Each structure stands twice: as structure tokens, then as C-alpha cells.
Amino acid sequence: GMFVDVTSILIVVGGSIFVVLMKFTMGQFFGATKIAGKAFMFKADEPEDLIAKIVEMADAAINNTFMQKGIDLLVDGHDADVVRAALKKDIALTDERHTQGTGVFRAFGDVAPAMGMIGTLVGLVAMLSNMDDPKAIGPAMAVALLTTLYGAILSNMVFFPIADKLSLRRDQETLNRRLIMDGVLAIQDGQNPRVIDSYLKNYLNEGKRALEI
Amino acid sequence: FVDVTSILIVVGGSIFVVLMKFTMGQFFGATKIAGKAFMFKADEPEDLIAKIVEMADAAINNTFMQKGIDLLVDGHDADVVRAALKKDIALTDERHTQGTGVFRAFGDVAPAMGMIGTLVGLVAMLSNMDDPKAIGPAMAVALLTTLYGAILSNMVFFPIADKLSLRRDQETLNRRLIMDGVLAIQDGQNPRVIDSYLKNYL
Amino acid sequence: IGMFVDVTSILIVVGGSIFVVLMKFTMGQFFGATKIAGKAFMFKADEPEDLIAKIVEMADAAINNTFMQKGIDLLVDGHDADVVRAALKKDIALTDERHTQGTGVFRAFGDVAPAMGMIGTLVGLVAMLSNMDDPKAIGPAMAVALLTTLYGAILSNMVFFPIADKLSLRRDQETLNRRLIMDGVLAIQDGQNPRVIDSYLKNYLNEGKRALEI
Amino acid sequence: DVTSILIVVGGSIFVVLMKFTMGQFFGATKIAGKAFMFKADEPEDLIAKIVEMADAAINNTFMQKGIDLLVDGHDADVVRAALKKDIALTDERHTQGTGVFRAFGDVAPAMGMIGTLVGLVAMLSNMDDPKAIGPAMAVALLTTLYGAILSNMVFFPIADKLSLRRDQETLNRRLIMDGVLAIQDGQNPRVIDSYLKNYLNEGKRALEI
Amino acid sequence: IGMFVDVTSILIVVGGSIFVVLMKFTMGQFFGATKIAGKAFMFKADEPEDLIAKIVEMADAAINNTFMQKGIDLLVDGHDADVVRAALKKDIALTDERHTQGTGVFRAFGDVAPAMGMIGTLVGLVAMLSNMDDPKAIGPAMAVALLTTLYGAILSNMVFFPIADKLSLRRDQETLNRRLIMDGVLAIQDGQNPRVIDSYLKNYLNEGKRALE
Amino acid sequence: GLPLWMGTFADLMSLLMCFFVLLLSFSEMDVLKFKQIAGSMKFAFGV
Amino acid sequence: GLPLWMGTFADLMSLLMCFFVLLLSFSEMDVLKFKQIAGSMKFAFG
Numbered sequence A: 001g002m003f004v005d006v007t008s009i010l011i012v013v014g015g016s017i018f019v020v021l022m023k024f025t026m027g028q029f030f031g032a033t034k035i036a037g038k039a040f041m042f043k044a045d046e047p048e049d050l051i052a053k054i055v056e057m058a059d060a061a062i063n064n065t066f067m068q069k070g071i072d073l074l075v076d077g078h079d080a081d082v083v084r085a086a087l088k089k090d091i092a093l094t095d096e097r098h099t100q101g102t103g104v105f106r107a108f109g110d111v112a113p114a115m116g117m118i119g120t121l122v123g124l125v126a127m128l129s130n131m132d133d134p135k136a137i138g139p140a141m142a143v144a145l146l147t148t149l150y151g152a153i154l155s156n157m158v159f160f161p162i163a164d165k166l167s168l169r170r171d172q173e174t175l176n177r178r179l180i181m182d183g184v185l186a187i188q189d190g191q192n193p194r195v196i197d198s199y200l201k202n203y204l205n206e207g208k209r210a211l212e213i
Numbered sequence B: 001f002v003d004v005t006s007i008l009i010v011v012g013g014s015i016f017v018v019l020m021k022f023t024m025g026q027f028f029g030a031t032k033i034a035g036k037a038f039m040f041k042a043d044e045p046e047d048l049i050a051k052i053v054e055m056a057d058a059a060i061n062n063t064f065m066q067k068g069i070d071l072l073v074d075g076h077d078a079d080v081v082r083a084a085l086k087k088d089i090a091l092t093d094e095r096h097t098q099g100t101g102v103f104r105a106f107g108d109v110a111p112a113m114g115m116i117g118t119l120v121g122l123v124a125m126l127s128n129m130d131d132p133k134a135i136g137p138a139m140a141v142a143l144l145t146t147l148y149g150a151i152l153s154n155m156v157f158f159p160i161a162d163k164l165s166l167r168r169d170q171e172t173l174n175r176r177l178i179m180d181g182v183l184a185i186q187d188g189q190n191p192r193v194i195d196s197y198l199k200n201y202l
Numbered sequence C: 001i002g003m004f005v006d007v008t009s010i011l012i013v014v015g016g017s018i019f020v021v022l023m024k025f026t027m028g029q030f031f032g033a034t035k036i037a038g039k040a041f042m043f044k045a046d047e048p049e050d051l052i053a054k055i056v057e058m059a060d061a062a063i064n065n066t067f068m069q070k071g072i073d074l075l076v077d078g079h080d081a082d083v084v085r086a087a088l089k090k091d092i093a094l095t096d097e098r099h100t101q102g103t104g105v106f107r108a109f110g111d112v113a114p115a116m117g118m119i120g121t122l123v124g125l126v127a128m129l130s131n132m133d134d135p136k137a138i139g140p141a142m143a144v145a146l147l148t149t150l151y152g153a154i155l156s157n158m159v160f161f162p163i164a165d166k167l168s169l170r171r172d173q174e175t176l177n178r179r180l181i182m183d184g185v186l187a188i189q190d191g192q193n194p195r196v197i198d199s200y201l202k203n204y205l206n207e208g209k210r211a212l213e214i
Numbered sequence D: 001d002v003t004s005i006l007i008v009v010g011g012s013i014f015v016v017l018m019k020f021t022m023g024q025f026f027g028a029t030k031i032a033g034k035a036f037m038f039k040a041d042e043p044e045d046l047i048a049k050i051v052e053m054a055d056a057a058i059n060n061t062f063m064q065k066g067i068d069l070l071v072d073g074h075d076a077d078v079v080r081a082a083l084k085k086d087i088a089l090t091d092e093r094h095t096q097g098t099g100v101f102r103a104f105g106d107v108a109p110a111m112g113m114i115g116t117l118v119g120l121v122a123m124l125s126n127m128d129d130p131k132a133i134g135p136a137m138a139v140a141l142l143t144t145l146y147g148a149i150l151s152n153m154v155f156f157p158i159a160d161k162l163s164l165r166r167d168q169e170t171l172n173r174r175l176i177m178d179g180v181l182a183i184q185d186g187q188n189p190r191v192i193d194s195y196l197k198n199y200l201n202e203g204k205r206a207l208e209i
Numbered sequence E: 001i002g003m004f005v006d007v008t009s010i011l012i013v014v015g016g017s018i019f020v021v022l023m024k025f026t027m028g029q030f031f032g033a034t035k036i037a038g039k040a041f042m043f044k045a046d047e048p049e050d051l052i053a054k055i056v057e058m059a060d061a062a063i064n065n066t067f068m069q070k071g072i073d074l075l076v077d078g079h080d081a082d083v084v085r086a087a088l089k090k091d092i093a094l095t096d097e098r099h100t101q102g103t104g105v106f107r108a109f110g111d112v113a114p115a116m117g118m119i120g121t122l123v124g125l126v127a128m129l130s131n132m133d134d135p136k137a138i139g140p141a142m143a144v145a146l147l148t149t150l151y152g153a154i155l156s157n158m159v160f161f162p163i164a165d166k167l168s169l170r171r172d173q174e175t176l177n178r179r180l181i182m183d184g185v186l187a188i189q190d191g192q193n194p195r196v197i198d199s200y201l202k203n204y205l206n207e208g209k210r211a212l213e
Numbered sequence F: 001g002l003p004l005w006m007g008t009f010a011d012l013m014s015l016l017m018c019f020f021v022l023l024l025s026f027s028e029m030d031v032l033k034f035k036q037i038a039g040s041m042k043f044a045f046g047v
Numbered sequence G: 001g002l003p004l005w006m007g008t009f010a011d012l013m014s015l016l017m018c019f020f021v022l023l024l025s026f027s028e029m030d031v032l033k034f035k036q037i038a039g040s041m042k043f044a045f046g
């Protein structure tokens, strides 16, 4: 009963995990898992709200780690080059983490159908071998079919779409971080809010958001 | 055959995965551009060349040409109009590549969930498998899912992707023609030499 | 033979391939492709050596190839070299684009023929299993499904892709013949000797796909 | 069972030997073994040793070779050339080993299927008992299974592991080259530590932080 | 009947492969590609150690290899380095293009062979499934299908694709050979130290596939 | 795209499918073994 | 590579393979018909 379900999930998920652990390390797999969880349960801050907070701060002179780091390095580091270097490094690092989480889940989605095909080969082998015990072809055919189905479902409805959501979230985080870096530069040189808003207004429809308009 | 649950499985799931891939506003954007590339024929480049010659002789049907004329009326310099036209062309190319990505993505996901749906139908049949005479037809309905994905993969979504690629190529070509005509008009040069220059590009 | 022929299968394959091709090509471009395919498959392309022979024969004097007829007609007309060159180059580019488009149409046909073969065999397996009361009689029913698959395979591998490849070969031969005709017509217009052009004209006879031959 | 893996690996080796000689094939197996039974050295210990040598003025073979080359007396560009050549040689060996196991992965399923087709020929040509038709097929089909396993679960995983080990050695050796250059030029330890800390947080390592 | 089956399967596979390749490639191209495959399988490329030895021998001197003969003739003929370099680079490019095109012919064979094997199995299975009424039909039909598929697999994997691979390996070997020849002739024309050029040519020995240390 | 050997894999699977269609062409129904298969499949598939 | 319908085709073919081995696992074959099938195959293959 439970043996065929656990065997199918074992072949598929265990094969995927073995191949990916030969590809990535356990700590890096855990890091990618954390990134996916953060991208799937927190909504990326809207850029328009980011511009609103940027102009509010400019006129004055929370709830966002990056700009809080910018204003903390602003009160201390008076030069703009140290802040620019740190901010670009953080943006590049986050881009790297998202790209590599994408890589981990694309690897999972690439390998899982291969494990489904190996599973149906194993089921064919077992039930072509027995062919005489009814209690022996049932589990075998179930293993074949369910390994194929789990490969298909995990590949096309979990791992590939998690990778695509991570790519989308990487683009959104890149945009938000670039806008916050621009705002920190604007508060560095004390630019007027109107000109910086006009300089940022070309970002509300940039790339994907160009289809809606 | 026809079957409501099977087409529902394919279409709903394809939309579901593509929605995790693309926002739903982008879904309308791609569908609308596919409709416009199917039902509204893009004007012949020769007709646009004829309109360019007529305008040069005097001193409009396309939005691009009309906006170029409006930009040249108030005497915008060469650099600003060149930048605006290049941005518009890259914007159109981006929109077309996004629509092609949407329909290509539908192409990859439709048969994947055809296989998902037929496997689900087959495990359901084997788990409720009583009558011998019905093992045949039941799996038949299961194949109905696969077939639909196949059709949608090969007769609807992939051809629309290729049609959008073709339309995009022609649109960038005609809009390059339009920027050249705009430059010639703001130059005020004679029609003959500018027509030769544009004919050199074809 | 009777067991290898069914009208529903051929109708499915051809209708669907034509539909998918017409969503990416027009009826005019498809007709042009068919005409170029017939012209390439019925009228062979002249060996270049015969072109040099005719060129040197008519150079000192200063007809089967229509491009050479156009060239000599423009030469007799008295047009300046710039316009003659422009018109001839336009003709070569038009022929090259037409041949590439014919290759594209037949490649699209060869790409979408086996896809619709799989669609047709899906339809056939649907019918076979929907009329499956006993696996005793499933031979011919499965056979017609395999038959749609085979029609797709044959049309893709032995008709449309060979026609596309033959059109690429014919376009390479056409480029060679057209450019040799260009050089010969230019030499005739200048009025030079027949021997002098034969020194540089044979240097690039085996260009590109003929480089393996030597 | 045994004859099936024998056929798959024999056909794979036979076809692959037309691309890689027995010398190169054994070199690839030696590289794979050395990467599998040994552990790569963590860059934190390398950074510690580099900063220790920099403040002062080793088991690691590249470290010993570089330190000896720099204490022998040689221009900066000469040590740069030697270190770059060694790093590139190791990179080339690892890429070629990845290529050998990738080629084995590409060829294994095709040879599994060839073995299966040969088995089916040998079975249909000696059909005697219906109840034993099944397992006979199962044996022939068995070959195909091994191809799949050897394609996805042996040869391709070793190709991935060699790629990973290659990145690890390239990163370690780049840290070594930078540290040796800093040792020669007498740089301040803080800037070199900053560079090493920056380098340790790029690439596939970035997910761990 | 068995001999008829073998003839028909060989005919389907090999004749179809030949016909489809002949549309793609000129008959002269096919003949030359066969000649190059034979030459690669029949002659062992001269080891780069021997060429380095010969190069240093005429390096400290101030003959078998044909390209060595051409380079020596050009160096004696008093032709400047640009003309000699360009001409022999043209010759190297010609041999590279030849080997690439022969690889293409055998790749085309290895692509079309399983396609024709599938055409053969479709034909054989259609014939068998139409003719469940007699053995005299299904025997040869199944034999045709299986043997045409097996021949497709074997010719594609163990003949045509590995011949393409051997041709590409020989192309790399001959490119290394003639690049060594270029370096040696140029070093002779400069007249540099035999030891320095010896070491610098030995430097090329660690290129591509020969990392076996 | 796909592995180049996938063509031969579909070849092999189609050959085996048609071989099994032929083996069904002279196969006969059994009721007790059918019920045994159905019951074991029900137990494996968690019903 | 190969077109994606090749993967769809291989998946469907293997799925029918599983289906038909399931069907045969509960079907009994003829004896003389199978012996004559085997004889024809043996004659055909050599």
C-alpha cells in the first residue's frame, strides 16, 4: 500500500537530491530554499512606494533593509564612493544569490523527469519480469506510473515555476535596489525632489511592465 | 472527441503556470498584440515610402509616421528625434518579444500538462478499475488531454509565436524606414536621393 | 498499396501542415515557393565553365541564360555602368531572397509535418481505444495511427527537407552563376581581352561547400 | 545483470576511445578518483595561512611551490606567469575530465538501447516458451535501464563533481596567487584580507550567507 | 526470406541515408568526405614531439612533412613573413574547412540514420498490424522494423558519429601540427635561440586533450 | 532540444508497443486473474 | 537536439507499453498460434 507511494517518491526525489547534491552543497541547497521561501511569502515592495519614501526622506533632509542601510552608512560615511561601493556590492550579491537559487531549482527540474523515465524503465523491468504474480505487477505498474507523474508534476508545477518566480523576484529586487541606490545618491548631492522624480518616472514601465501599457 | 474537463485541465493549468511566470496584465498584452498582428495588416513599406515622397514634395496613415511629423513640426533637433524613435522601436521590439515569450511559454506548458492530465486520468482509472470492457474507452478520454496539449502546442501557440516574431521583424524594418524618412524630411533633401538611400537598405 | 493508404490521415497531415504554414506565410509566398521548387527540380543549373566559354566567345565579338539576355539588353540600351550594376545586383538579391524563402517554407512544412503526424496518431489511438471492446481486433486501428505518423515522417525526411536542402544547393549554385555573369558582363562593358579575365575568374570556382571537393 | 553493465560500459568505452586515448581516459579516471576520495581545502584556512605568512614577513602543495618560488628570488611577472600556467593547466585537466565523463554520459543510453535491440533480436530468434517471453525481454530491456542510470546517476554526476571541484581549485588558487603577490609586494594585511573576504563571497558560495 | 529481410533493412537505412545526404551534399563532397575518413583512420598523425625535434634541428642548423616542405620552400624563396604567414594560414584554414565539412557529412549521416530507421519501423509495423492474418507477413515485417531500427542505432552511434568525432579530433591534431609548423618557421626566420623556441613550442604540448600528466 | 538518442528510444518503445499489440492479437481474456490484478492495483494505489 | 514532440511521443509510447503489459498480464496466449508465430520469426531472422 504505502510501499508504492514511498518507492515512487523515493526514486524521483532521492535521485534528484543525489544528483543535485553532487552538483551543489547541502548548505547552498539550504540557502536556495531560504531564498525561495522569502520570495514566496513576502511581497516585494512596490517601486512607487519606494519613490514616495525617497522623496519624503529628501524633503525631511522605514520597513526596508536596503535604504535603512543606506541611511545608516550615510550618517557615518560622508563620502559617496564608499556608499556607492557598498550598495553596488550588496545589489550584486543579492543578484548572485537569486541567480544561484534559480540554478538550484532549474537543476531539480531538469533531473526530475530523468528520474521519472528511469522509474518507468524500472517498473517495466519488474512487471515484465514477474508477469505471473498479480501481487507483483500492481506495485510495479504503480511505481512506473507514479514516478512518471511525480517527475512531470515536480518538474513543471513546483521546481520550474519556483525558478521562474525566483527570476522574476530577482528582477524586482534589482529594480528596487537600483531605485534605492539612486535615491541615496540624490540625498548625497541633495538634488531637488522634482528632478529625481522625473529621472525615475521612466521606471514604472520598464521591461515586463511594458506589456500592460 | 470533445470533453470539458480535459480542455479545462489543459487550459486552466497552462494559464496557472504561465501566471506564475507572467503577470496577468502581461497576458492581456500578449493576447492583444497577437490579435493585432493577425487581424490588422501592417502597411506596405512601399506605401510608407510613397507617403514620405509626398510629404517631401509638399515641403499620413501610420502612428509612427504621424508622431514623427508632429515631433518635426516644432523643430526638434536630430538627436532628440533619433533618441525618441530608437526608444519607441526598442519598446515595440520588447513588447513583441514579451508576447512571443508568453506564447512560447504556453507552447512548452500545454503538452507538459497534457501528460500530467492523462497520467492523472490513468491512475484514477487504474484505482477505480472494475469492468474489462471499459478499460479501453476510459484511457481514451485520458488521451484526450494529451491531444489537446499537442494541438495547442503545435497549431495555436507555437505558430502565433512565429507569427509574432515575423511581425516584429517587419515592424523594426518599417520603423527604421520611418526614422530614415524623418531624418530626410528634417534635412529637406530632394526626394530622389533619399529614395535611393532608403532603397539601398532593402 | 491498400494497407498503406488512408484518406483521412493524408488529409489531416496536409491540411494541418498547410494551416500552420499559412499562419506564418501567405498564399502568395507559398505559391512562389512551389514555383521555385519546381523550377529547381526540373531545370538544371548551368555549369560555370560553360558560362565562361560563352562569355569569352561573346567578348571578342563585342544564348540560353535569361540573366545574360537581360545583361546584354541593358548593354545594348547604352545605360551607364552604375545603373546596370544596380539593376543586376537587385535581380540577384531578389532571386536569393526568393530561394531563401522557398527553403524557409519547405523547412516549415518539414518541421510541422511530423508534429501533425503525432497529432494524427493521437487521434487514431483515441478512436482505436474508444472502439476497443477486445484487444483481439486492434491491428488495423493502430495501423492507421502509425500510418499518419509514417506520412509525417516520410514527408518531413524525404520531401520537404530534401527540397529545402536542394533549394539551398540551388541557391549556392545560383549565387555562383549570377556573380560570374556579373563579372563577365562588366568585362564586356569595359571592353577588355578574353584571356585576361580568365586568370582571376577561376580563382574562386570551388568556393565554400565545394572546398571539400579538392 | 552483469553482462548488461558489461555491454553498456564496453560499448561506451569502445566508442569513447575514438575521442580519448587510453592515456587520457586513465588520466580522467585518476582525476575523478582524486576528486572523490580526497577533500578540497577550505578557503578560510588558506586565508588564515596567507595572513599568517604576511604578518610573519605548509602542507598545501601549491602553497609550498609558490612560497619556494618567491623565496628563490624572481620578478613579480615571472611568478605571475608560473602561477597562471599552473592554474590554467589544472583548469584544462578538469575541463577535459568533465568532457570525458560527459561523453560517457552521452554515449551510455545509446549503447544501452543498442544492447536492448541486440537482445530482442536474440530473443525473437529463439522464441520457445510464452511464459518466459516476459523476463527475457526484461533482461534485454535491462540494458537500457543501466544506460539511464549510468547516464544520469554515474557519469553525469562525476562530470558535475569535476566541474565543481574545478571551480573550488580555481578559487583556492586565485586566492593563493593574490596572497603570494601581496606577500611579495609587502602590502598592508588589512587590504589583502578585505580582498580575500570579498572573493570568498562570490559564485556558488553566495547562497551560504 | 531472411536474406531478403536483411537486404531490405540495409537498403532502407543506407539507401535513404545516402539519398537524403546526396540532396544536402554534392556527390564530390560525399566522395571527399569518405576519402578524409579513410585517411584519418589509416594514417597516424605525426607526434608533436617529432615536429619539435625537427624544428629545433633546423633551428640550430642555421625531411618528411609536406607542410614542413612548403614552409621551408617559402623561407628559402626569400618571401617576407606577411606573405608566407597569410598563405600558409590560408592552407591551414583550407584543411580546417575540409575536416569540418567531412565531419558535417558524417554528422548528417548520423542524424538521418535513426530517422530512416524510424521510417523503416513505421513501415514494418504498419505491414504487421495490417496483416495479423498470416505469419509469412508478420515475420519479415517485424524483422524489417527491428533490424532497420537497430541498424539506424548502430550506424548512427558506432560508425557515423564516432567517425565525425575522430575527424574532429584529427582536425584539432592537424591544426596543432600546423600551428607548431608556423611557430617553428617564424622562429627560424627570426633566428631565435633554439633553446627558447624549444621550450616555447613544448609549451604548446599542454593544449587541448593531451593533459595526461 | 532533446537527447539525440530519444529518437531511438521512441523507436524502441513503438517496437515494443506493437509487439505487445501482436501478443494481444491472439491473447484471451481471463476473469479471475483480471480480478486479482484489479484488487492488487487498488491496494497499491491506496484505495 | 530533437523536437519536443519527440519527448511527447516517447512518453506516450512508453505509457502504452505499460498499458499493454498490464493488459497481457491477465490474458492467456494461444499455444499453436504462438508456436507458429515463433517459427515464422525464426525463419525471418535467420
Ligand SMILES: N=C(NC(=O)c1nc(Cl)c(N)nc1N)Nc1ccccc1
Pocket: C114, C149, C153, E110, E111, E112, E114, E115, E117, E118, E119, F004, F005, F006, F007, F008, F009, F010, F011, G001, G002
Ligand atoms: N527515431 C526517430 N529519430 C529521429 O527522428 C531523429 N534522430 C536523430 Cl539522432 C536526429 N538528429 N534527428 C531525428 N529526426 N524518431 C522519429 C522520426 C520520425 C517519426 C517519429 C519518430
Ligand code: NA
Pocket: A120, A145, A148, G011, G014, G015
Ligand atoms: Na509515462
Ligand code: NA
Pocket: B122, B139, G015, G018, G019
Ligand atoms: Na495506463
